[PDB]
Amino acid sequence: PLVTPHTQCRLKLLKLERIKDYLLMEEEFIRNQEQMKPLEEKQEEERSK
Amino acid sequence: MEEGGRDKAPVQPQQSPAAAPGGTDEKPSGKERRDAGDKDKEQELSEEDKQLQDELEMLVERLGEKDTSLYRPALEELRRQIRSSTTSMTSVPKPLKFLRPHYGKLKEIYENMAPGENKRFAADIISVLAMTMSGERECLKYRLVGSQEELASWGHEYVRHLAGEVAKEWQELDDAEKVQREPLLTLVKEIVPYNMAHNAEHEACDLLMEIEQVDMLEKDIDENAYAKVCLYLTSCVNYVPEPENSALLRCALGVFRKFSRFPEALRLALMLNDMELVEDIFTSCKDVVVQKQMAFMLGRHGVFLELSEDVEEYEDLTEIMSNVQLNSNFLALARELDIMEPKVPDDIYKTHLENNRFGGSGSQVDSARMNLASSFVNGFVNAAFGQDKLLTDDGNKWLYKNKDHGMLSAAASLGMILLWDVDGGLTQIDKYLYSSEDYIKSGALLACGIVNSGVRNECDPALALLSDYVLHNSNTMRLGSIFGLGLAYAGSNREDVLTLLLPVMGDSKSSMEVAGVTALACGMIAVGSCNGDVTSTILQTIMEKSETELKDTYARWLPLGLGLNHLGKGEAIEAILAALEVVSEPFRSFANTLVDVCAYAGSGNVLKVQQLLHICSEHFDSKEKEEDKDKKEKKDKDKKEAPADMGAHQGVAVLGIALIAMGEEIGAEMALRTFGHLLRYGEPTLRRAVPLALALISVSNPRLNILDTLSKFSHDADPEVSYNSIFAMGMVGSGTNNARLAAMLRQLAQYHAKDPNNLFMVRLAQGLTHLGKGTLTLCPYHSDRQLMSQVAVAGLLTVLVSFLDVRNIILGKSHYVLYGLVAAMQPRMLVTFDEELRPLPVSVRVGQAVDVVGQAGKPKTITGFQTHTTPVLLAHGERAELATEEFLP
Amino acid sequence: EVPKEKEKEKVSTAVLSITAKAKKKEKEKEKKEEEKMEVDEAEKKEEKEKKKEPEPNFQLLDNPARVM
């Protein structure tokens, strides 16, 4: 909640692009999180039956 | 819909420019005079910015666009006056003649020939005529020219002075908030050659105003809060001479060009330190310029003020060095015994009184490792003159009872009892020194470095602890002697005792923990030069760590002093230096992420933060490089604590979801030390998010991982109501959460929040945002703990006395010569004002009202009234000078 | 008879931001470091095209010769 220039200034152009940077990286990190999982055991036979 | 009947302008300027090809040839007068009658009238129907709808500007081009395509090029015999009538009349509607690919063709009408002095018909109009159109030129057209071809044609040559007079025109017409539009213009034009734009805009600002400097002045540093590496390199040194040349506010030099010390050049701020020694004006601004130069952002300045004026103008140096340090001791002596302080509270241990009736009876806890935490009822509360004769008898018995590492620990607590002391601090140690034991003297003489820490005067540069070190043939005499003196001289960058303690590294006496803290001792000293330290560390690193694949005593201590010797520069040469120096196996390439990001303390360099994720993200990694992904996450913790809360909300959003949610060894072992590194203020967002993963202990792991996250959950200073969490978790933490392992720890967490009533500033932010370190002194501890087995033996050197850079506490004292004033200060929740109406009310929390030594708190820019002017630096800093003037009736 | 050894190996970093001009000035840094100290590497074309066109449709065959 810090958009405090409150006018058409380059700061609010700079501030919101920073927010774009962190959320895209949060997207791509969890995109890599469901990608690079070579672990399969399913449930080691216990919960699967 | 009342159209028709009064459509004069959609008819006669529909016909006369349509008759302009009918009257260019064979009508030399009608080509010129109807053009001039078109030009001034279309100019007149735009100058009032109270009719945006112009009866020509979007009425004529419906045929006039195809007309101008056949009038301007196809004439081919353009005179010297008819180009000044065509281009002055037809370059006006072209942002609205053309659609969004206007960006390549703001020139096919205009830059045929720019007619004369285009602001002559664009002076009183703000941006409707051409000033928005001028920004459209500098956005796309100049950037494609000035991408690689800055030194170029008319698109640069006249465009320089064209942007010069336009940037004068923003502070000419109305002098509104379009002042800040000039950095919007100066930075979009030639982004990397900003200084080549700014050098003309520096001298233009020097002759612009002396009242309309300050909001543009803070506009620069708000844009300098985060940028690219080169933009933060450029606009910060453009920021320097504006209170030096235009105005002479000039007391914002020392700390706010410590902004510009490490990025541009270390000698450049030393030339600004020379610019301090030029403007020696009176004394009052000079006093508080040099108040910060000792123990607010750096020391090591005691060699440049012993020149030819050693009477009072250069005899402030030792006054800065240790006397106002001792006047700060007179704060904790006089003022803080007055507010709320007798010599021993000693009763946070006694606050565990009601537990003995909670569930029947008590007196069941007899664990011997609790007696380690029993030293901190005496230890932490006695900082800032908690001097104790015979109140150390709980120490005196337990020193002579058992627990050799606690014999070192209780002896090391005496340096915390007498902190910031030079007067009689060694005399307190000497009676508790001569016991002729290894552990007693190695803790006490390490604590002697803690006593004279921050003094850096003549106490013992090689007197006491160098003689303690050459006693070595054995245990912690070999270890505990080099640590305290490098702790005391951490603020200095002296070369001599660094070369005295470099044969500690060159001895190759293979005591591993001694060589590890040797890197930590030399790391606290220097941050810049002496590449031979980097040579000396990697020699024994290649000798020892290559012939092993084992514990992090190698890894947590030896590359860390490398990162401390190269902290805080985003040049990315230090990564080329260090990583190509230790090209090696991956367990030695654990050190790849250390010196990479230790040079990356704080900025916006998001391209590093993605390579801080994308290389070693998860991989599931069956127990091979799990330390490296923890240490890669360790370097995510910094570059987050300085972007002044812009990325702190994003840091707690990512690291709450991504790791502790969908992680493994990265999240559920180590990723809580962010919150033990991001802030120490405390707020119930993260203070309640940690017991979401702590009340759920998740005991299946070696739970002291999660109980390490218990420990520095209480790494938030400024004492609070957080006792509700710790005491209630201590109640479930006595029986369950085994007292064999963490009964020291929970009470270490309990007793650290109320360290002392005051002196909680350990959070690397001075004035408004500058670092002033604490980094070289803190970051060894969070590098020390992220495992185990240092809760018993080795980390007891660290866990007591790791971080010792606490720089006083509040901004109450007045110092007006005799030090008698107290004034009227008015404390509030901090500023939000960025650009609003004129006198921007600085803060919002008017309720609190004190006079004198009142607290700092989390967001407090405390102001004052009653016409005392407070004309010192107008940016605070806890040793204000406060002159007196009242010429307003 | 290859098993088609394949690799996931990467997800392309699609952060389109201030990155674009930051990599461009890094390529300017290589124009001082590469072409001024040592880069003299070269390769040759059309060796692999040369052996194809003089080919044998004149294949010689012993007694029990297969033919489609």
Side-chain angles (χ1 to χ4, degrees), chain A residues 1-41 45 48-49, chain B, chain C:
Chain A
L2 199 280
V3 291
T4 184
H6 290 168
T7 186
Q8 294 295 319
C9 182
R10 193 178 176 273
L11 286 174
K12 285 172 69 176
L13 183 61
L14 289 175
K15 288 181 176 68
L16 294 174
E17 286 176 353
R18 293 293 308 275
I19 302 169
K20 182 178 257 73
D21 289 331
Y22 290 108
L23 270 80
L24 283 170
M25 284 173 61
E26 186 178 1
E27 185 187 8
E28 293 293 327
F29 182 74
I30 197 167
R31 183 66 178 171
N32 290 318
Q33 183 65 260
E34 291 105 15
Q35 182 60 255
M36 293 179 184
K37 300 286 102 176
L39 68 155
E40 57 92 19
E41 47 92 27
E45 194 177 0
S48 62
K49 294 181 181 180
Chain B
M1 281 72 75
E2 291 87 5
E3 292 87 5
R6 299 294 178 90
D7 292 332
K8 182 65 65 66
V11 168
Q12 191 277 127
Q14 184 60 255
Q15 184 64 41
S16 297
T24 301
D25 192 74
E26 79 260 8
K27 284 178 72 69
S29 66
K31 184 264 301 298
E32 180 68 29
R33 295 295 93 195
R34 292 180 295 172
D35 197 1
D38 196 4
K39 183 174 71 68
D40 59 355
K41 186 261 298 298
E42 191 270 334
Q43 192 272 138
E44 181 64 31
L45 269 71
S46 177
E47 291 296 323
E48 67 275 15
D49 290 329
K50 294 187 64 53
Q51 292 176 358
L52 70 95
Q53 293 81 6
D54 300 334
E55 296 290 327
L56 275 76
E57 193 268 330
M58 293 296 290
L59 272 301
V60 64
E61 82 279 6
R62 299 292 185 267
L63 192 273
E65 174 63 35
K66 299 296 186 291
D67 185 77
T68 307
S69 178
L70 274 72
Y71 182 76
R72 180 67 183 173
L75 193 270
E76 293 291 330
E77 51 98 23
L78 276 304
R79 301 275 75 79
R80 80 280 299 154
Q81 185 179 3
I82 77 171
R83 60 101 183 272
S84 65
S85 295
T86 300
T87 58
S88 178
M89 186 270 291
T90 50
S91 301
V92 175
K94 70 181 176 66
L96 283 79
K97 286 180 180 176
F98 298 105
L99 72 162
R100 298 282 76 77
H102 188 204
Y103 289 160
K105 55 184 181 181
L106 291 93
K107 68 177 179 65
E108 67 181 2
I109 298 171
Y110 183 75
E111 203 177 1
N112 297 116
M113 187 64 205
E117 293 86 5
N118 293 313
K119 69 175 176 64
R120 58 95 175 171
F121 68 102
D124 204 7
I125 183 169
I126 293 96
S127 295
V128 182
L129 201 290
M131 284 66 252
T132 301
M133 188 271 284
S134 299
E136 293 174 353
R137 293 181 69 91
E138 304 297 330
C139 181
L140 195 274
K141 294 178 71 66
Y142 183 77
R143 188 177 64 243
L144 60 88
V145 174
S147 296
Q148 66 182 358
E149 188 64 28
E150 292 87 2
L151 274 299
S153 65
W154 184 263
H156 188 202
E157 297 293 327
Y158 181 76
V159 167
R160 186 262 185 192
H161 188 272
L162 183 63
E165 55 89 16
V166 166
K168 295 299 290 183
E169 193 270 332
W170 294 108
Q171 299 90 15
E172 183 67 29
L173 196 153
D174 193 75
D175 203 2
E177 294 291 326
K178 283 90 171 65
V179 176
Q180 295 181 358
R181 182 64 183 272
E182 189 270 327
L184 266 67
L185 193 275
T186 314
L187 183 53
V188 172
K189 181 181 187 293
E190 53 185 356
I191 299 100
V192 177
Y194 178 75
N195 198 3
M196 192 271 176
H198 190 276
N199 196 4
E201 296 296 324
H202 181 74
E203 295 177 354
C205 184
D206 293 334
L207 57 92
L208 194 145
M209 196 64 204
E210 297 298 327
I211 305 300
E212 197 63 26
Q213 298 301 107
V214 293
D215 58 349
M216 193 278 299
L217 194 280
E218 59 90 20
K219 178 64 188 293
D220 293 332
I221 198 63
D222 198 4
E223 293 179 352
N224 288 318
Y226 61 96
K228 188 58 70 176
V229 174
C230 62
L231 273 73
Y232 183 74
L233 183 67
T234 302
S235 62
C236 289
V237 74
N238 292 119
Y239 177 77
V240 177
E242 290 287 332
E244 182 68 27
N245 197 5
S246 67
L248 276 306
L249 269 297
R250 76 187 169 87
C251 194
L253 198 286
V255 284
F256 294 163
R257 277 73 172 173
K258 185 69 175 176
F259 287 168
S260 177
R261 184 172 177 86
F262 291 99
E264 287 83 1
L266 274 298
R267 56 93 53 83
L268 184 61
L270 196 274
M271 292 299 107
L272 293 166
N273 194 3
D274 196 4
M275 289 303 108
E276 292 180 353
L277 270 70
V278 170
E279 54 192 6
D280 297 335
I281 28 114
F282 280 4
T283 306
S284 296
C285 67
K286 174 54 68 183
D287 186 73
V288 186
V289 161
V290 304
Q291 289 317 126
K292 276 87 79 177
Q293 299 293 327
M294 178 64 204
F296 288 92
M297 72 281 198
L298 84 163
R300 67 181 64 91
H301 76 286
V303 297
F304 290 156
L305 278 302
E306 191 63 26
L307 278 75
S308 67
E309 281 82 5
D310 287 326
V311 177
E312 291 179 353
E313 192 265 331
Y314 284 169
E315 290 294 324
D316 199 6
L317 180 65
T318 310
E319 293 177 353
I320 290 304
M321 188 175 177
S322 295
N323 196 3
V324 301
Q325 179 182 2
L326 194 275
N327 208 168
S328 172
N329 291 117
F330 187 73
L331 188 150
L333 282 171
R335 295 292 93 195
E336 294 296 324
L337 293 175
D338 289 333
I339 295 300
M340 206 284 119
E341 213 267 349
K343 290 184 181 292
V344 276
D346 202 75
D347 285 330
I348 302 98
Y349 181 76
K350 190 263 181 183
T351 313
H352 296 84
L353 184 63
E354 296 293 326
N355 53 0
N356 291 318
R357 296 294 94 194
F358 290 163
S361 297
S363 296
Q364 191 178 2
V365 179
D366 288 329
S367 65
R369 291 177 62 87
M370 184 180 176
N371 207 355
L372 277 73
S374 299
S375 66
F376 299 101
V377 187
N378 197 5
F380 284 165
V381 82
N382 289 320
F385 296 102
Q387 59 183 358
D388 289 332
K389 295 296 185 186
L390 297 175
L391 274 301
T392 62
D393 285 335
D394 54 351
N396 206 169
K397 298 289 103 176
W398 180 56
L399 184 68
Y400 293 157
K401 191 256 291 178
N402 60 358
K403 189 58 70 177
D404 54 352
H405 297 90
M407 294 199 290
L408 190 145
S409 296
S413 66
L414 296 174
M416 293 186 287
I417 293 171
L418 275 83
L419 188 61
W420 295 98
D421 294 336
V422 74
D423 52 355
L426 295 176
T427 64
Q428 295 287 317
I429 304 298
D430 291 330
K431 291 187 285 184
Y432 293 99
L433 183 63
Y434 293 99
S435 179
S436 178
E437 293 292 327
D438 182 75
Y439 293 93
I440 296 173
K441 290 181 180 291
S442 298
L445 294 173
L446 189 147
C448 292
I450 299 166
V451 174
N452 59 5
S453 178
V455 180
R456 69 182 290 274
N457 213 170
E458 52 96 19
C459 181
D460 45 356
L463 191 276
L465 277 75
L466 195 277
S467 65
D468 193 11
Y469 179 69
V470 298
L471 194 147
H472 66 278
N473 51 2
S474 66
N475 206 359
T476 60
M477 298 295 176
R478 177 71 179 172
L479 196 147
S481 179
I482 53 96
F483 183 74
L485 198 148
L487 188 145
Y489 292 162
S492 296
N493 197 358
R494 59 185 293 165
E495 182 65 29
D496 50 355
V497 77
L498 184 143
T499 58
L500 266 297
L501 297 178
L502 193 143
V504 183
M505 188 68 70
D507 197 5
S508 181
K509 184 178 178 181
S510 295
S511 297
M512 184 61 213
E513 289 84 4
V514 177
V517 301
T518 304
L520 295 175
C522 69
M524 289 173 68
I525 298 169
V527 295
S529 296
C530 190
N531 207 166
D533 288 330
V534 177
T535 301
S536 66
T537 52
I538 66 157
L539 256 289
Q540 188 173 359
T541 302
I542 294 169
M543 291 304 108
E544 290 181 352
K545 190 174 172 64
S546 65
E547 293 180 354
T548 196
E549 291 86 4
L550 291 176
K551 68 179 73 65
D552 288 330
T553 305
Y554 293 91
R556 289 174 289 173
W557 289 348
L558 295 176
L560 267 296
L562 289 172
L564 294 180
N565 207 170
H566 292 289
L567 189 142
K569 71 280 289 181
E571 65 181 5
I573 285 95
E574 298 296 331
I576 303 300
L577 289 176
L580 295 174
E581 192 177 4
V582 202
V583 280
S584 62
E585 60 93 18
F587 293 163
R588 290 181 293 173
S589 297
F590 175 78
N592 194 4
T593 182
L594 272 307
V595 195
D596 194 4
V597 199
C598 284
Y600 291 163
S603 291
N605 60 6
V606 180
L607 284 78
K608 187 267 303 171
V609 191
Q610 64 182 357
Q611 72 182 357
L612 190 68
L613 292 178
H614 289 295
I615 286 92
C616 52
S617 295
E618 296 88 6
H619 294 84
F620 179 69
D621 191 62
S622 294
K623 278 77 179 174
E624 293 179 354
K625 68 179 75 66
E626 291 294 335
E627 295 87 2
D628 187 74
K629 289 184 261 74
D630 292 331
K631 187 60 71 177
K632 185 66 70 67
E633 182 60 37
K634 179 67 175 68
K635 308 306 286 295
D636 189 76
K637 300 173 172 63
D638 54 351
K639 194 61 76 181
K640 190 175 286 186
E641 59 92 20
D645 193 68
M646 187 61 70
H649 295 289
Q650 296 296 322
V652 302
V654 170
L655 301 183
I657 296 298
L659 296 178
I660 178 115
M662 352 255 307
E664 293 177 350
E665 186 284 340
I666 297 98
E669 302 280 327
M670 189 268 170
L672 200 275
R673 300 278 75 78
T674 300
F675 293 169
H677 188 272
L678 185 62
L679 54 89
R680 301 165 186 82
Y681 294 126
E683 63 184 2
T685 61
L686 82 165
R687 191 182 289 278
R688 272 71 177 171
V690 179
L692 301 181
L694 261 296
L696 273 300
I697 301 100
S698 298
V699 300
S700 297
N701 59 8
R703 79 275 193 190
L704 269 296
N705 51 16
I706 303 299
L707 269 66
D708 184 74
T709 69
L710 199 161
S711 68
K712 300 292 109 177
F713 167 67
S714 292
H715 194 261
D716 297 335
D718 193 5
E720 293 295 328
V721 74
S722 177
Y723 180 74
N724 195 5
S725 298
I726 306 299
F727 178 72
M729 197 174 183
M731 187 65 204
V732 76
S734 67
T736 62
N737 328 92
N738 306 179
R740 296 292 184 184
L741 293 172
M744 184 271 291
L745 184 145
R746 275 77 54 96
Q747 292 179 356
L748 183 65
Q750 182 63 261
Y751 298 158
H752 183 71
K754 187 69 73 176
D755 17 12
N757 305 320
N758 57 352
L759 187 138
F760 64 84
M761 190 63 212
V762 281
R763 207 176 291 106
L764 188 147
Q766 296 297 109
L768 192 146
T769 186
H770 65 276
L771 189 66
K773 294 317 204 317
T775 92
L776 279 69
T777 319
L778 183 273
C779 189
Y781 179 69
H782 293 86
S783 177
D784 187 76
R785 222 14 135 198
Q786 62 265 279
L787 258 336
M788 199 180 176
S789 70
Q790 283 183 347
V791 299
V793 175
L796 273 72
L797 272 297
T798 302
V799 67
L800 279 79
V801 292
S802 179
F803 60 100
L804 292 170
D805 283 342
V806 204
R807 291 193 297 274
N808 323 341
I809 169 105
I810 70 134
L811 59 96
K813 271 188 183 293
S814 295
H815 289 96
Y816 176 77
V817 179
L818 190 145
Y819 178 67
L821 279 70
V822 282
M825 285 180 282
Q826 196 269 124
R828 281 184 287 173
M829 195 86 70
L830 191 141
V831 307
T832 58
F833 74 98
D834 198 2
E835 62 267 24
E836 281 86 8
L837 57 91
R838 209 349 212 249
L840 249 340
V842 288
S843 64
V844 80
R845 192 60 265 173
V846 77
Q848 281 72 240
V850 297
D851 52 354
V852 68
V853 300
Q855 249 332 62
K858 179 267 177 185
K860 275 81 177 176
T861 304
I862 302 101
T863 61
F865 61 98
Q866 192 59 39
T867 316
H868 196 73
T869 66
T870 92
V872 185
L873 77 158
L874 196 64
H876 302 22
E878 81 180 3
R879 199 166 297 116
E881 184 67 27
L882 294 175
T884 169
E885 186 64 31
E886 204 261 330
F887 68 111
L888 271 303
Chain C
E1 293 303 321
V2 294
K4 187 62 177 65
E5 180 67 30
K6 64 180 72 65
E7 295 292 327
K8 302 285 102 174
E9 179 70 28
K10 276 176 72 174
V11 176
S12 66
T13 62
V15 179
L16 294 176
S17 294
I18 60 173
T19 69
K21 62 100 176 179
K23 62 98 178 177
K24 185 260 292 180
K25 67 181 179 67
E26 182 65 30
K27 300 286 103 175
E28 192 271 331
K29 292 181 181 180
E30 295 294 326
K31 300 287 103 176
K32 186 175 172 65
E33 295 292 327
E34 293 291 327
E35 65 183 0
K36 299 286 102 176
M37 290 74 167
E38 182 68 29
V39 50
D40 285 325
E41 186 176 0
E43 185 64 28
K44 183 60 69 178
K45 193 258 293 179
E46 71 187 1
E47 184 178 1
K48 279 78 178 175
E49 192 270 331
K50 182 64 70 177
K51 65 178 72 66
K52 292 182 180 180
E53 59 185 1
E55 66 182 1
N57 346 35
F58 61 103
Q59 291 86 11
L60 302 175
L61 294 173
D62 290 330
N63 301 115
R66 54 93 40 76
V67 54
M68 187 178 289

